Design a protein around this ligand. Sequence first.
Ligand SMILES: [Cl-]
Ligand SMILES: [Cl-]
Ligand SMILES: [Cl-]
Ligand SMILES: [Mg+2]
Length: 393
Amino acid sequence: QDASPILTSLLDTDAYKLHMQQAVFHHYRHITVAAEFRCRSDELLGVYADEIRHQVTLMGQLALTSDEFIYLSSLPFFQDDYLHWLRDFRFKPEQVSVAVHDGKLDIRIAGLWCEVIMWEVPLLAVISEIVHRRRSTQVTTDQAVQQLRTKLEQFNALSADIDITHFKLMDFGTRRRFSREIQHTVVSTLKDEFPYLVGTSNYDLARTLALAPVGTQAHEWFQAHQQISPTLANSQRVALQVWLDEYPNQLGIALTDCITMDAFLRDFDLAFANRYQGLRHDSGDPIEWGEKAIAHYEKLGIDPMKKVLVFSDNLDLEKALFLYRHFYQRIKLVFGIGTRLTCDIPDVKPLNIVIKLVECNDKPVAKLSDSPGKTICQDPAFVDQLRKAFALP
Ligand SMILES: [Cl-]
Ligand SMILES: [Cl-]
Ligand SMILES: [Cl-]
Ligand SMILES: [Mg+2]
């Protein structure tokens, strides 16, 4: 139905959103933030504004169900104070401003971080579904399934000569999925047909398909700490410590490129390297990055085979297999694939859209990374300050 909701579950979002939301609820309940939409491509999405606005209002109706509560209570991640608060949580549509200027979609979101944090993934998934169902009216679940099966055949062919049994794939594709139904179809097909699927970031699919919910933290956790910790140069160490404080023995993958990998390794001391299970790559050459990670573990006396590298920088299954060949004899590996799984249909172009943190406590925050052109920060002075504090060139 035209005006009917695209989203019907509060769990149709990525696990890292709830994992971070709980940390923010426990530690930073009164901190405010602002976040903004960007369309990375040369695309104009202004025409979709009214429909996006309508869906944003609809999201005000989403509410945790009792079955969902019981499911979350079964997992090792959640405390009951948070779960009781989550049961009362409702999106507040007023937090989201949708405007159009020169045909460009402008979306800004502002309010308490523990509330605002929940918008990013479902709002992106709603924008994605709105745009695709308008532009690509002929797409069937069958087309999506057949493309997936062709790729799984190519994967099997290219891996026949190696021990592929340590290959691990995560679905990370909620945000820019072609639609909710396409994601459901491809993830269910993977569970039934691909031994190496280890889980999905989507909490609703983790529950309903009986898969492990995966995902730890995201850049906003590190970025927000740039306006939380008194010392800017320590903001990433504080973010790593507060995460362990919240999750001492679960969710132990640290994202490495809010600043740069080199800066990260300067912060990643023996205690962090022992308590965390592993590291996630999101920018720069993955070969160089993985080698840096392995060498760091060796320098600290840690057996790299007892740690994990997570790769998820807009991967496809072929690139993931190539990375596996390079690293699998030396360290444990997980590969998160996003749009290449949930929006890979003949004659359909994926959208390159994001919603990223721009302020915390009314002050700028930024992600640098090891890839140029990934900075949304519109405060060049702050970016300069951040570079200085982290001793970057
Ligand atoms: Cl746009
Ligand atoms: Cl579904
Ligand atoms: Cl792929
Ligand atoms: Mg220390």
